Ligand binder design. Structure first.
Ligand code: NA
Length: 367
């Protein structure tokens, strides 16, 4: 009964959304960013994942990142080759996996990255002096998406559905499209234009749109109001997402473990209630414990709190961030384990949960 904002979405896109709406009550899809691109201790293999090396299974949800595409770069801001990315997207989809894409858009005013807070939203929205630049930027995704398509013998074009998750964590002040650097109304204009341009002007039919505030900058005593800062409206959102690294052991969080667990549960309960009220689907779109320093993280700090409340449990999926290559990037940053990593066995047991679905355990999501 949730319905997509694209009333003409492709059969497979409509099927995915319907199937997520059904599965969410008893299951949780596991996801990982850049899962096929590299791991902490490897890069180059065209069919490998840290997640699979540990569990024997690929993640159910594959996250990818477009930052730099808009500048005509051959690889994204983390040096992930766009052609390989298209290959990996098609591969994952072919196996029945789910595809989600975020976009750390470079600052069009300063030339800095997303974390350069130089204001720019006002320039990019309709009527702004750099509106043509926004169009140019979005066009690069249109072309990327075309690259994902297969054409059958009859000339019908087939695309992987994509959970497109733009302009994320906009309630934070760390991105140029964020609170403090863009007016709320201008942010809403940017979101609405993104939807109109992709869905209506360019006629992309394979997108599911995900909205994703950061939990750390939401007041738990006024959760809904915080969550809905810069919310563009029900006609522009399909997935009621949330990025929450805070309640899963962030080093700056002085709350006790028990208090954090309770907050994670409460955040997800409220997230679910919001999605239910709007006829949408909720998801924990980014989370994780950087460097996986927390014993039994998977069962105790993630699965446990998700499962501790009936409402909280109705999220459809959870994605953890990337496993940065140590040799290349020069320091440790990772959110899934790899063989030998402390939390690897707990992660296997997490996988073995009937609740948690990896790629190998998915029903047919696309019919
Ligand atoms: Na499982």
């Amino acid at each position: 009964l949730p319905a997509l904002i694209d009333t003409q979405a492709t059969a497979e896109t409509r099927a995915l959304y319907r199937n997520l709406a059904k599965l969410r009550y008893k299951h949780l899809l596991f996801g990982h960013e850049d899962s096929l691109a590299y791991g902490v201790h490897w890069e180059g293999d065209m069919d490998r994942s840290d997640v699979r090396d540990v569990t024997g299974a690929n993640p159910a949800v594959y996250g990818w990142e477009l930052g730099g595409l808009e500048l005509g770069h051959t690889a994204n801001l983390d040096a992930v080759n766009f052609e390989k990315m298209q290959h990996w997207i098609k591969a994952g989809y072919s196996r029945g996996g789910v595809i989600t894409i975020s976009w750390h858009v470079f600052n069009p005013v300063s030339g800095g990255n997303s974390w350069d807070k130089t204001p720019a939203v006002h320039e990019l929205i309709p009527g702004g002096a750099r509106h043509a630049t926004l169009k140019a930027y979005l066009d690069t995704f249109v072309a990327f998406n075309e690259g994902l398509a297969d054409v059958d013998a009859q000339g019908n074009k087939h695309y992987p559905p994509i959970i497109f998750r733009p302009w994320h964590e906009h309630n934070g002040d760390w991105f140029w499209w964020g609170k403090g650097h863009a007016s709320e109304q201008d942010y809403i204009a940017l979101w609405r234009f993104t939807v109109h341009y992709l869905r209506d002007e360019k006629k992309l039919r394979n997108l599911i749109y995900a909205y994703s505030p950061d939990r750390s900058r939401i007041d738990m005593a006024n959760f809904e109001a915080g969550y809905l800062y810069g919310y563009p409206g029900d006609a522009y959102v399909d997935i009621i997402g949330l990025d929450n690294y805070w309640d899963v052991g962030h080093e700056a969080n002085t709350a006790s473990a028990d208090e954090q667990k309770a907050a994670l549960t409460a955040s997800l309960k409220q997230l679910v209630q919001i999605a239910r009220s709007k006829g949408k689907i909720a998801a924990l779109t980014e989370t994780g414990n950087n460097r996986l320093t927390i014993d039994n993280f998977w069962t105790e700090r993630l699965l446990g709190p998700i499962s501790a409340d009936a409402d909280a449990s109705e999220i459809a999926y959870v994605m953890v961030w990337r496993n940065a290559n140590l040799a290349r990037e020069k320091s440790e940053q990772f959110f899934a384990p790899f063989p030998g990593q402390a939390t690897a066995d707990d992660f296997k047991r997490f996988y073995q949960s009937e609740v948690v679905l990896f790629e190998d355990e998915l029903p047919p999501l696309y019919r």
